[PDB]
Amino acid sequence: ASGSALIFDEEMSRYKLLWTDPECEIEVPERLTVSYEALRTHGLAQRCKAVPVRQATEQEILLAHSEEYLEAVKQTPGMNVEELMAFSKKYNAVYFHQNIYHCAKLAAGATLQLVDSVMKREVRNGMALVRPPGHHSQRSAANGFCVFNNVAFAALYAKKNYNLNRILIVDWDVHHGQGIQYCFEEDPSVLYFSWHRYEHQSFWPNLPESDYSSVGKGKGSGFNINLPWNKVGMTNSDYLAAFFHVLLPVAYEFDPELVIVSAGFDSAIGDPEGEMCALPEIFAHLTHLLMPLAAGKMCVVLEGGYNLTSLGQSVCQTVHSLLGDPTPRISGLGTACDSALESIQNVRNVQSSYWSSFKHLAVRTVVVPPPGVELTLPKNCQHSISESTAKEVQRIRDKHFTDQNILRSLGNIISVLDRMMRSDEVCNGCVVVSDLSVSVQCALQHALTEPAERVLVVYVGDGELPVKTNDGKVFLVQICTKETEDKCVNRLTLCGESLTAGFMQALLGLILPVAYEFNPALVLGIVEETRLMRVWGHMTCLIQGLARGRMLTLLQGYDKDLLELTVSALSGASISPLGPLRAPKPEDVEMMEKQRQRLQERWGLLRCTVSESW
Ligand SMILES: NCCCc1ccc(C(=O)CS)cc1
Ligand SMILES: [K+]
Ligand SMILES: [K+]
Ligand SMILES: [Zn+2]
């Protein structure tokens, strides 16, 4: 499966508000046009498979709505403006139009076309630019600019026509999609996550069940997660902390078979409804962080978003990530604000009785295989020295250290670094080396010599490496099997059956927050002398979210499986699911909490509880 589907039609922009109603004046047809033209101006729309729109059938509509409400809406095309206004007064924050029933059927049908495209392996993922939005509509009521619930349609449709048992819905719109929650509150097969402006119930829709204490009812208890922002102005740090410490661990433990996104961009800076301070680029990462789920099968559906400029920018960021283009570096990240930390600690505590991870106590890639080893590399890869490179190698040899093979590996390292950093030609790479010491020294020092302010080293093995963590230029993440006794603040040391769950927990809760706050210019991966076979691909894919994806992996020893997985993850292929994760060993959880308490003073992004005032 390859490619991304873009589903859009100008007909969904042919309905508008016909009377004066300041509540709805923001929901304009231009939202679609500005969006699509955005993807057109940046050349993104041309790279997507343009799947056409269809109407949703009556049975498909009845999957999520009542026949009475369907018959009521079905009659709006026959009403004049006075009758339409009277009909709109019967619901909250909603207007109807002569074409709105048609357009809502088109929006639902576009969502279903996207679901069919993704599940039939015709495309890897995709986005649907639809209108009206859906996540506020309920079984027998239009609500909040929404007529029919597109995402609930998608989930129920996937369940019915593909026998899916686990679906994840991520609603990053700034409003609480109460329609989806109502639809799946007793359903443990569809996990609904939603962050939303709440302000202690004073923000629309002013529902007590939008609060963190609504975990779902009945058999679906623990499969409805609400994260209420109780203050405006939430930044990139708040969003990323919500992902790292709430959504992503639950998601990877859940192991969904399909991910559907209520992509509402009224949660971005500039929007008059959300009033948050998140830059559009954050949506490149919110997308990217979810790609390893469901083997990449992601369905992005448009919801809110009303600042035309920031809306176009955020849509472009999302599509950029869906196509696999390098995610942009996010700087200035730090601790979440106190209100966000309160919301996060509350939702974690209440959900801990369902997810034990929350309990507390009081050419894209290049490949340098061993000489003579001919490999079958994917279409986004290529193989490998010059006079300048050989001169630099001779210089470092006569200055700091006669194998000829190690010299070849060093020249290849210098060449791939030059191609990654001093050019847009190559993004990331992988080299099989012999001597780990000399290879790592050359790699790190030459990366620092190139315009690389900071470097994030990720070493899997034991013993000490030749890398100094004194100055604020290098951060080391060591995955070992021996004692830690960590002392430096620029290092994260980590020490067989429960190893997969523990490693994923450590990656989502400790590695990614520190690494995102660090904002490196180059990630340098090392693997000594094979439990890593279970997790290494996920780590590579998730760590590519930094340094614009520029990652140089050094592998000490040939392993066809490990090399294949490394290059596949680096080149952007789909990651295979880990299977439903379980519980890590309690000693490992205690060790992770100790590392967090050790590092969270310097690295605020590690916090998931409001700090204690001395
Ligand atoms: N009268 C204030 C609340 C009215 C309202 C309702 C919904 C939205 C959305 O953005 C839907 S995604 C916006 C405004
Ligand atoms: K939401
Ligand atoms: K649910
Ligand atoms: Zn909204």
XYZ file of C-alpha atoms and ligand atoms in Angstrom:
631
model
C 0.000 0.000 0.000
C 1.307 3.428 -1.005
C 0.050 6.957 -1.528
C -2.358 9.298 0.223
C -5.956 10.006 -0.774
C -7.301 13.554 -1.042
C -11.101 13.679 -1.146
C -12.666 17.053 -1.927
C -15.435 18.537 -4.049
C -16.430 22.149 -4.715
C -20.100 21.214 -4.227
C -19.576 21.056 -0.451
C -18.813 24.798 -0.581
C -22.224 25.617 -2.080
C -24.152 26.316 1.121
C -23.918 29.228 3.533
C -25.697 31.134 6.283
C -28.549 33.143 4.766
C -29.619 35.273 7.765
C -27.899 37.234 10.521
C -26.571 34.880 13.205
C -23.246 35.864 14.823
C -22.956 32.403 16.385
C -22.527 30.784 12.951
C -20.926 33.612 10.934
C -17.538 31.860 11.152
C -18.604 28.640 9.365
C -18.154 29.849 5.787
C -17.752 27.978 2.470
C -14.397 29.716 1.942
C -12.984 27.356 4.595
C -12.937 24.647 1.927
C -11.617 26.793 -0.927
C -8.779 28.387 1.071
C -7.905 24.893 2.291
C -7.771 23.212 -1.112
C -5.957 26.093 -2.814
C -3.428 25.891 0.021
C -2.661 22.274 -0.869
C -2.661 23.420 -4.497
C -0.160 26.244 -3.998
C 2.358 24.037 -2.164
C 2.053 21.158 -4.640
C 0.634 18.766 -2.050
C -2.783 18.101 -3.605
C -1.124 17.044 -6.870
C 0.761 14.260 -5.047
C -2.402 12.688 -3.590
C -4.773 10.197 -5.185
C -7.944 12.194 -5.899
C -10.708 9.794 -4.883
C -14.114 11.182 -5.943
C -16.957 11.995 -3.567
C -20.187 10.004 -3.310
C -23.431 10.384 -1.397
C -23.945 8.402 1.778
C -26.886 6.033 1.443
C -29.956 6.052 3.679
C -28.814 2.869 5.438
C -25.348 4.343 5.974
C -26.972 7.441 7.486
C -29.146 5.240 9.709
C -25.995 3.572 11.062
C -25.682 6.575 13.401
C -28.919 8.610 13.250
C -32.626 8.048 13.783
C -35.177 7.749 10.999
C -37.202 10.629 12.466
C -34.282 13.074 12.370
C -33.262 11.818 8.918
C -36.782 12.414 7.584
C -36.787 15.853 9.227
C -33.530 16.897 7.549
C -34.543 15.286 4.233
C -37.262 17.953 3.897
C -35.016 21.013 4.263
C -34.206 21.202 0.491
C -37.856 22.166 -0.026
C -37.953 25.050 2.466
C -37.541 28.766 1.856
C -35.386 31.038 4.013
C -38.106 31.654 6.616
C -38.857 27.945 7.033
C -35.124 27.185 7.137
C -34.582 29.762 9.892
C -37.487 28.337 11.899
C -36.037 24.836 11.470
C -32.586 26.030 12.555
C -33.987 27.607 15.730
C -34.870 24.082 16.935
C -31.184 23.148 17.404
C -28.163 24.788 19.018
C -25.543 26.692 16.986
C -26.827 25.362 13.660
C -28.081 26.784 10.375
C -29.697 24.921 7.488
C -29.579 25.594 3.748
C -31.390 24.268 0.681
C -28.234 22.367 -0.322
C -27.026 21.430 3.170
C -28.705 18.004 3.184
C -27.039 17.243 -0.151
C -23.691 18.567 1.098
C -23.901 16.606 4.364
C -24.617 13.409 2.448
C -21.562 14.297 0.350
C -19.410 14.866 3.453
C -20.397 11.515 4.962
C -19.926 9.779 1.610
C -16.479 11.324 1.219
C -15.553 10.037 4.675
C -16.741 6.552 3.693
C -14.817 6.722 0.403
C -11.681 7.533 2.401
C -12.332 4.600 4.740
C -12.794 2.271 1.759
C -9.619 3.577 0.096
C -7.523 3.036 3.230
C -8.939 -0.350 4.253
C -8.784 -1.765 0.706
C -5.020 -0.997 0.697
C -5.509 1.257 -2.338
C -3.715 4.034 -0.410
C -1.690 4.173 2.791
C -3.644 7.025 4.416
C -5.622 10.088 3.406
C -7.544 13.219 4.288
C -11.087 14.307 3.425
C -11.771 18.044 3.067
C -15.467 17.927 3.937
C -18.204 20.342 4.981
C -20.347 20.351 7.144
C -18.305 18.998 10.073
C -19.725 16.132 12.099
C -18.408 15.553 15.597
C -21.152 17.529 17.399
C -24.147 15.944 15.655
C -26.061 13.360 17.673
C -28.520 10.544 17.027
C -31.548 12.811 16.563
C -30.139 16.346 16.492
C -27.977 18.683 14.487
C -25.596 20.595 16.724
C -22.642 22.966 16.458
C -22.408 23.395 12.657
C -22.832 19.606 12.297
C -25.668 17.784 10.516
C -24.407 14.186 10.386
C -21.521 12.626 12.325
C -18.955 11.810 9.642
C -16.390 10.193 11.953
C -18.973 8.063 13.765
C -20.129 6.975 10.304
C -16.546 6.010 9.476
C -16.068 3.978 12.660
C -19.380 2.103 12.475
C -18.844 1.524 8.740
C -15.365 0.074 9.273
C -16.733 -2.190 12.011
C -19.602 -3.410 9.837
C -17.824 -3.876 6.502
C -14.351 -4.940 7.677
C -14.979 -6.739 11.008
C -12.607 -4.436 12.869
C -12.485 -4.984 16.626
C -10.390 -1.955 17.652
C -10.614 1.568 16.218
C -9.053 4.752 17.613
C -10.678 8.160 17.098
C -8.509 11.193 17.897
C -10.496 14.449 18.050
C -8.002 17.318 18.202
C -10.657 19.912 17.411
C -10.819 22.578 20.111
C -14.459 21.696 20.865
C -15.626 18.505 22.539
C -17.091 16.113 19.989
C -19.904 15.028 22.290
C -21.718 13.292 19.427
C -18.933 10.742 18.985
C -18.688 10.200 22.746
C -22.445 9.614 22.944
C -22.227 7.241 19.977
C -19.458 5.054 21.436
C -19.578 5.588 25.216
C -20.636 1.989 25.927
C -18.521 0.614 23.061
C -15.044 -0.719 23.977
C -14.213 -1.403 20.311
C -14.009 2.324 19.460
C -11.684 4.354 21.699
C -12.539 8.069 21.611
C -9.925 10.605 22.723
C -10.691 14.323 22.800
C -8.896 17.372 24.124
C -11.016 20.480 24.196
C -11.393 23.983 25.566
C -13.508 23.628 28.701
C -12.734 26.432 31.183
C -14.444 24.526 34.021
C -17.618 23.891 31.944
C -18.039 27.579 31.011
C -17.143 27.005 27.340
C -19.501 25.633 24.713
C -21.111 23.089 24.735
C -21.025 23.511 28.571
C -21.410 19.814 29.361
C -20.425 18.192 32.674
C -19.794 14.933 30.791
C -17.110 16.690 28.734
C -14.954 16.558 31.880
C -12.097 14.164 32.613
C -14.350 12.062 34.865
C -16.364 10.770 31.873
C -14.483 7.538 31.156
C -17.328 5.803 29.337
C -20.166 3.735 30.751
C -20.832 0.018 31.014
C -18.609 -2.307 28.997
C -16.837 0.697 27.451
C -15.462 2.087 30.705
C -11.946 3.369 30.069
C -12.429 3.807 26.309
C -13.594 7.445 26.439
C -10.862 9.948 27.330
C -11.612 13.655 27.793
C -8.817 16.180 28.364
C -10.286 19.553 29.348
C -8.186 22.651 28.809
C -9.317 24.920 31.646
C -7.316 27.908 30.344
C -6.858 29.410 26.888
C -3.433 29.922 25.334
C -2.290 26.289 25.287
C 1.015 26.031 23.432
C 2.866 23.330 21.508
C 4.276 22.047 24.810
C 0.798 21.433 26.242
C -0.317 19.529 23.134
C 2.833 17.404 22.987
C 2.633 16.642 26.717
C -0.987 15.560 26.254
C 0.153 13.236 23.469
C 3.197 11.821 25.292
C 1.576 11.331 28.706
C -2.073 10.564 27.865
C -3.007 9.682 24.290
C -0.001 7.783 22.927
C 0.584 5.221 25.735
C -3.131 4.361 25.771
C -3.086 4.157 21.969
C -0.096 1.819 21.738
C -1.509 -0.369 24.511
C -4.845 -0.397 22.652
C -3.171 -1.277 19.306
C -5.939 0.013 17.016
C -6.684 -1.571 13.661
C -7.718 1.808 12.204
C -7.105 5.428 13.229
C -9.650 8.138 12.398
C -8.900 11.795 13.135
C -11.459 14.512 13.751
C -8.993 17.062 12.391
C -10.379 20.330 13.692
C -7.859 23.131 13.315
C -9.706 25.656 15.464
C -7.179 24.486 18.085
C -4.394 26.398 16.299
C -3.037 29.887 16.887
C -5.151 32.679 15.425
C -8.519 30.919 15.543
C -11.246 33.119 17.099
C -13.057 30.161 18.696
C -10.246 28.225 20.386
C -7.825 31.032 21.286
C -4.915 28.613 21.688
C -1.287 29.341 20.793
C -0.279 26.152 18.965
C 1.572 26.719 15.703
C 0.321 24.878 12.590
C 3.520 22.796 12.465
C 2.375 20.958 15.614
C -0.191 19.186 13.426
C 2.657 17.759 11.368
C 3.783 16.032 14.564
C 0.359 15.081 15.942
C -0.065 13.333 12.592
C 3.446 11.871 12.545
C 3.233 10.539 16.111
C 0.138 8.500 15.156
C 1.472 6.991 11.910
C 2.954 3.815 13.523
C -0.580 2.953 14.700
C -2.794 0.602 12.669
C 0.141 -0.023 10.293
C -0.210 3.560 9.057
C -3.897 3.214 8.162
C -5.013 6.732 9.130
C -8.182 8.558 8.035
C -8.063 12.332 8.561
C -11.439 14.100 8.366
C -11.898 17.865 8.559
C -13.942 19.359 11.385
C -13.484 22.924 12.644
C -10.976 25.657 11.901
C -12.031 29.204 11.099
C -8.954 31.450 10.719
C -8.537 30.985 6.966
C -4.770 31.609 7.028
C -3.825 29.326 9.921
C -6.392 26.825 8.615
C -4.645 26.535 5.260
C -1.271 26.290 6.986
C -2.379 23.525 9.372
C -4.033 21.572 6.550
C -0.765 21.772 4.617
C 1.182 20.552 7.659
C -1.136 17.561 8.098
C -0.961 16.573 4.422
C 2.825 17.059 4.441
C 3.101 14.528 7.261
C 0.634 12.158 5.564
C 2.856 12.088 2.465
C 5.937 11.390 4.603
C 7.728 14.690 4.050
C 10.239 15.634 6.779
C 8.521 17.063 9.838
C 9.711 20.561 10.819
C 11.739 21.035 13.984
C 9.815 22.487 16.938
C 11.844 24.774 19.204
C 11.035 26.560 22.438
C 9.298 23.483 23.844
C 9.265 23.137 27.611
C 6.984 22.297 30.495
C 3.234 22.361 30.122
C 1.450 25.107 32.019
C 0.068 24.377 35.479
C -3.541 24.117 34.282
C -2.589 21.622 31.570
C -0.578 19.614 34.102
C -3.601 19.547 36.420
C -5.854 18.313 33.607
C -3.269 15.687 32.633
C -2.722 14.389 36.169
C -6.485 14.229 36.759
C -7.240 12.304 33.568
C -4.290 9.969 34.205
C -5.427 9.226 37.761
C -9.034 8.558 36.792
C -8.026 6.378 33.820
C -5.412 4.465 35.850
C -8.006 1.880 36.910
C -8.265 0.918 33.216
C -4.724 1.567 31.903
C -2.222 0.393 34.526
C 0.505 2.553 32.935
C -1.028 5.559 34.745
C -0.962 4.230 38.325
C 1.194 6.072 40.859
C 2.218 5.640 44.494
C 2.124 7.968 47.488
C 16.512 10.008 -2.761
C 15.417 9.769 0.868
C 17.686 7.135 2.453
C 21.131 5.819 1.540
C 22.540 2.431 2.543
C 26.165 1.387 3.038
C 26.104 -2.415 3.482
C 29.234 -4.503 4.055
C 31.498 -4.583 0.990
C 30.203 -7.064 -1.563
C 26.782 -7.393 0.097
C 24.196 -6.689 -2.612
C 20.761 -5.954 -1.135
C 17.293 -5.334 -2.579
C 16.513 -1.811 -1.309
C 13.145 -0.022 -1.597
C 12.553 2.599 -4.272
C 13.365 5.486 -1.890
C 16.937 4.305 -1.219
C 20.370 4.206 -2.849
C 23.857 2.890 -2.124
C 27.007 4.865 -1.255
C 34.074 8.329 -1.299
C 35.718 11.326 -2.987
C 39.094 13.058 -2.930
C 38.050 15.560 -0.251
C 36.479 12.793 1.841
C 39.594 10.615 1.567
C 41.779 13.584 2.525
C 39.664 14.226 5.628
C 39.817 10.520 6.523
C 43.611 10.518 6.203
C 43.705 13.657 8.364
C 41.669 12.140 11.194
C 43.721 8.932 10.899
C 47.127 10.605 11.165
C 45.769 12.848 13.934
C 43.825 10.495 16.227
C 44.510 6.828 15.395
C 45.327 0.320 8.950
C 42.185 -1.722 8.291
C 41.077 -0.179 4.946
C 37.601 -1.564 5.665
C 37.223 0.662 8.735
C 38.640 3.486 6.612
C 35.974 2.721 4.002
C 33.224 2.818 6.632
C 34.559 6.147 7.928
C 34.672 7.660 4.444
C 31.106 6.483 3.872
C 30.049 8.052 7.184
C 31.626 11.375 6.195
C 29.991 11.225 2.752
C 26.498 10.406 4.031
C 26.785 13.145 6.666
C 27.798 15.660 3.988
C 24.819 14.581 1.875
C 22.343 14.737 4.776
C 23.298 18.071 6.332
C 24.934 20.128 3.552
C 22.272 19.221 0.962
C 18.572 18.593 0.454
C 19.526 15.518 -1.591
C 19.522 12.956 1.240
C 17.476 12.849 4.447
C 18.776 9.925 6.536
C 21.091 6.939 6.238
C 22.431 3.699 7.674
C 25.986 2.315 7.717
C 27.279 -1.078 8.870
C 30.592 -0.552 10.674
C 33.266 -2.678 12.343
C 34.995 -0.696 15.108
C 32.261 1.023 17.111
C 34.695 3.375 18.870
C 36.276 4.984 15.805
C 33.027 5.016 13.815
C 31.095 6.759 16.600
C 33.889 9.272 17.207
C 34.119 10.157 13.510
C 30.334 10.384 13.144
C 29.724 12.614 16.174
C 32.732 14.879 15.615
C 32.071 15.353 11.897
C 28.386 16.025 12.574
C 29.382 18.730 15.055
C 31.844 20.080 12.466
C 28.969 20.355 10.016
C 26.302 22.938 10.906
C 24.811 20.723 13.644
C 24.325 22.697 16.857
C 23.008 19.725 18.855
C 23.148 15.945 18.442
C 20.906 13.280 19.987
C 22.775 9.982 20.355
C 20.651 6.845 20.828
C 22.865 3.860 21.682
C 21.542 0.330 22.250
C 24.160 -1.695 24.087
C 26.398 -1.796 27.131
C 29.632 -0.131 28.160
C 30.748 3.447 27.661
C 30.982 5.207 24.296
C 33.451 7.928 23.226
C 30.949 10.777 23.575
C 31.196 13.630 26.089
C 27.892 14.801 27.596
C 29.387 17.813 29.414
C 28.511 20.822 27.253
C 24.946 21.420 26.125
C 25.520 20.003 22.642
C 24.995 16.215 22.907
C 22.292 14.201 24.664
C 22.807 10.452 25.108
C 20.046 7.852 25.467
C 21.643 4.522 26.393
C 19.604 1.302 26.365
C 21.644 -1.179 28.399
C 21.191 -4.388 30.382
C 23.499 -3.522 33.312
C 23.444 -1.047 36.196
C 22.718 2.623 35.558
C 23.557 4.862 38.541
C 22.982 7.851 36.279
C 24.422 11.192 37.393
C 24.792 13.520 34.397
C 21.676 15.446 33.369
C 22.444 15.031 29.641
C 22.103 11.230 29.758
C 19.210 8.770 30.039
C 20.254 5.215 30.937
C 17.734 2.373 30.718
C 18.032 -1.245 31.855
C 12.906 -10.211 28.919
C 9.275 -11.054 28.194
C 7.770 -7.736 29.349
C 10.614 -5.875 27.611
C 8.435 -4.706 24.706
C 5.775 -2.986 26.824
C 8.418 -1.459 29.084
C 10.442 -0.167 26.144
C 7.385 1.387 24.499
C 6.444 3.017 27.811
C 9.974 4.404 28.186
C 9.977 5.656 24.587
C 6.647 7.470 24.893
C 7.087 8.745 28.451
C 10.789 9.573 28.765
C 12.682 9.424 25.463
C 10.343 11.430 23.224
C 9.639 14.290 25.701
C 13.337 14.864 26.433
C 14.265 14.536 22.766
C 11.539 16.962 21.658
C 12.583 19.546 24.240
C 16.209 19.039 23.170
C 15.437 19.828 19.493
C 18.545 18.283 17.892
C 19.913 18.870 14.415
C 21.015 15.236 13.968
C 19.951 11.926 15.518
C 22.748 9.345 15.669
C 21.682 5.731 16.215
C 23.997 2.967 17.436
C 23.252 -0.752 17.876
C 25.893 -3.062 19.349
C 26.700 -6.655 18.280
C 17.834 -9.492 19.319
C 14.983 -8.029 21.361
C 15.422 -4.768 19.429
C 13.800 -6.617 16.511
C 10.445 -6.052 18.220
C 10.717 -2.302 18.812
C 13.558 -0.789 16.741
C 11.306 0.108 13.811
C 8.857 1.993 16.020
C 11.725 3.877 17.666
C 13.221 4.837 14.298
C 9.866 6.011 12.932
C 8.968 8.022 16.042
C 12.446 9.526 16.485
C 12.416 10.739 12.875
C 10.023 13.419 14.153
C 13.161 15.362 15.131
C 15.993 17.040 13.214
C 13.826 17.118 10.059
C 14.238 13.336 9.992
C 18.023 13.553 9.528
C 19.147 10.346 11.254
C 22.393 8.420 10.749
C 22.252 4.863 12.101
C 25.448 2.878 12.693
C 25.020 -0.899 12.955
C 27.878 -2.938 14.438
C 27.517 -6.284 12.704
C 25.447 -7.568 9.802
C 21.876 -8.697 10.483
C 19.680 -9.050 7.398
C 16.497 -8.725 9.465
C 17.763 -5.784 11.531
C 19.239 -4.019 8.494
C 16.017 -4.527 6.526
C 13.906 -3.162 9.386
C 16.251 -0.204 9.928
C 16.255 0.845 6.272
C 12.505 0.252 5.925
C 11.691 2.469 8.907
C 14.181 5.119 7.774
C 12.825 5.238 4.204
C 9.253 5.793 5.415
C 7.536 2.431 4.952
C 4.699 1.326 7.215
C 5.681 -0.003 10.635
C 4.237 -3.357 11.634
C 1.960 -3.395 14.704
C 3.416 -4.557 18.007
C 0.199 -6.351 18.912
C -1.895 -5.363 21.936
C 0.630 -4.369 24.590
C 0.154 -5.297 28.238
C 1.925 -4.407 31.482
C 5.643 -3.838 32.113
C 7.474 -5.264 35.091
C 6.884 -3.140 38.229
C 10.636 -2.783 38.797
C 10.901 -1.232 35.327
C 8.042 1.183 36.061
C 9.728 2.227 39.310
C 12.972 2.766 37.391
C 11.199 4.896 34.775
C 9.533 7.016 37.463
C 12.926 7.479 39.129
C 14.502 8.608 35.847
C 11.604 11.028 35.315
C 11.950 12.534 38.797
C 15.697 12.819 38.189
C 15.370 14.628 34.855
C 12.062 16.526 34.909
C 13.521 19.584 36.661
C 15.762 20.247 33.650
C 13.372 18.803 31.033
C 9.926 20.214 31.785
C 8.292 18.199 29.002
C 8.676 15.106 31.218
C 6.155 16.454 33.734
C 2.718 14.858 34.001
C 1.809 16.284 37.430
C 1.696 19.840 38.735
C 4.924 20.497 40.614
C 5.131 20.917 44.384
C 5.834 24.442 45.608
C 8.596 24.505 48.226
N -22.351 30.698 21.102
C -21.003 30.113 21.278
C -20.910 28.621 20.805
C -21.339 28.296 19.340
C -20.375 27.395 18.550
C -20.556 26.001 18.399
C -19.654 25.183 17.675
C -18.505 25.722 17.054
C -17.542 24.857 16.289
O -16.389 25.287 16.040
C -17.887 23.461 15.800
S -16.376 22.472 15.376
C -18.314 27.096 17.200
C -19.220 27.898 17.923
K -11.905 17.745 20.529
K -15.608 4.482 23.494
Zn -14.548 23.118 16.726
